[PDB]
Nucleic acid binder design. Structure first.
Ligand SMILES: O=c1ccn([C@@H]2O[C@H](COP(=O)(O)OP(=O)(O)O)[C@@H](O)[C@H]2O)c(=O)[nH]1
Length: 351
DNA sequence: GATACTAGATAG
DNA sequence: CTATCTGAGTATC
């Protein structure tokens, strides 16, 4: 049994980019299950073998981390072109890891064929004919199917909480008490404005000391429907392996999601925040039944409630420490079901 | 004539 | 909002 995992549209090297990081963590967690897996990317490297140096059909299973098909600058995107070229030659079922609602599987040929540099490729090279099974991080398979309505070779849909890989890694450990220099923190990208309303509501004009780290930029928030005057402090992106330690600099860390994530997706930040030294404050809309933690104190309905909850936490170390103890305990209860999670993943990829 | 990383705008 | 069209600014093993 030999498994290959690739990221469909991003180079994989280290933890400097989120797409590369996710691919490496998945490679790592699968390896820790006792499976023989290789990451195939553009070049040979510490964690990867090159697309041009292996035979895709030497693998019994081909796992593909989702990505968009974006030819930046209208120019060829080697990551996506090489990945689909690799996928097109595979003669078995492909397992598409659907971890981001914005990234459903799609064919690149229909996009490439109308490009001026189309002559560089052919339908035979890029058209993926293998059947695809979508492993949805979201429990709602109707949303997953709707996202893939345009493609016809996707024949299977199954839910699996992929993002738990963070807490099941062999070397996982909760964050220790950390010096507090921030009231609230949130790390991520602009996500093409798919979450602008929520970001503005909970992170802007709060009067609190807030930091927004990641690839998001102040200039990106310009939708006239979600006005603001004061912004949080935007800082640069950091390696994914350091996210919980970064979150730990704040009294609290925010949990929000895209509309289609509400009561559907559990995201990496839920675990990264839960494991940090920052109290997890969740947007009520994201988890209306409080399935994450059965304690209303961890939930906020709007900006005013977030402000009040944060001040309560700063005013009472006893309360803050109690809540951290609780979220840490809840996380451990899920970590206790590691074997169950590993087995379910194996079955998801027909093993 | 560097190279790597990262969808935004417009139409229907 | 979904389908379709257009195609660059910032950061650097
Ligand atoms: O500087 C940063 C900011 C974010 N992240 C990662 O990016 C994820 C968030 O991704 P995204 O912006 O797509 O938001 P989501 O939809 O996951 O909430 C976080 O959970 C981290 O794992 C990271 O590695 N570095």
């Amino acid at each position: 049994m030999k498994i290959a995992i690739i990221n469909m549209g991003n180079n994989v090297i280290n933890f400097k980019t989120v797409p590369s990081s996710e691919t490496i963590y998945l490679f790592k967690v699968i390896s820790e299950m006792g499976l023989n897996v290789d990451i195939i990317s553009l070049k040979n490297g510490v964690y990867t073998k090159s697309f041009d140096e292996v035979d895709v059909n030497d693998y019994d299973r081909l796992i593909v981390v989702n990505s968009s098909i974006n030819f930046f600058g209208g120019k060829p995107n080697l990551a996506i072109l090489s990945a689909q070229k690799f996928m097109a030659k595979y003669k078995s079922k492909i397992y598409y890891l659907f971890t981001d609602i914005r990234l459903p599987f799609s064919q690149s040929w229909p996009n490439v064929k109308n490009r001026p540099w189309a002559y560089l490729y052919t339908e035979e090279e890029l058209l993926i004919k293998s059947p695809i099974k979508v492993i949805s991080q979201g429990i709602n398979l109707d949303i997953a199917k709707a996202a893939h309505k345009k493609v016809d070779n996707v024949i299977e849909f199954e839910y699996f909480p992929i993002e738990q890989y963070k807490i099941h890694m062999n070397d996982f450990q909760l964050s220790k008490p950390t010096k507090k220099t921030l009231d609230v923190i949130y790390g991520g990208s602009f996500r093409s404005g798919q979450r602008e309303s929520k970001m503005v509501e909970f992170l802007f004009d709060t009067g609190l000391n807030i930091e927004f780290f990641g690839n998001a930029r102040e200039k990106q928030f310009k939708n006239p429907k979600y006005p603001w005057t004061k912004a949080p402090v935007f800082t640069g992106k950091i390696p994914m392996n350091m996210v919980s330690e970064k979150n730990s600099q704040a009294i609290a860390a925010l949990i929000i999601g895209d509309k289609n994530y509400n009561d559907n997706f559990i995201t990496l930040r839920v675990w990264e925040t839960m494991a940090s030294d920052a109290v997890m404050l969740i947007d009520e809309e994201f988890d209306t039944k409080h399935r994450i933690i059965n304690d209303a104190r961890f939930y906020v309905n709007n900006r005013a409630e977030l402000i009040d909850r944060v001040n309560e936490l700063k005013h009472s170390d006893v309360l803050r420490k109690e809540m951290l103890s609780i979220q840490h305990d809840i996380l451990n209860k899920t970590r206790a079901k590691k074997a169950e999670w590993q087995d379910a993943f194996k079955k998801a990829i027909d093993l």
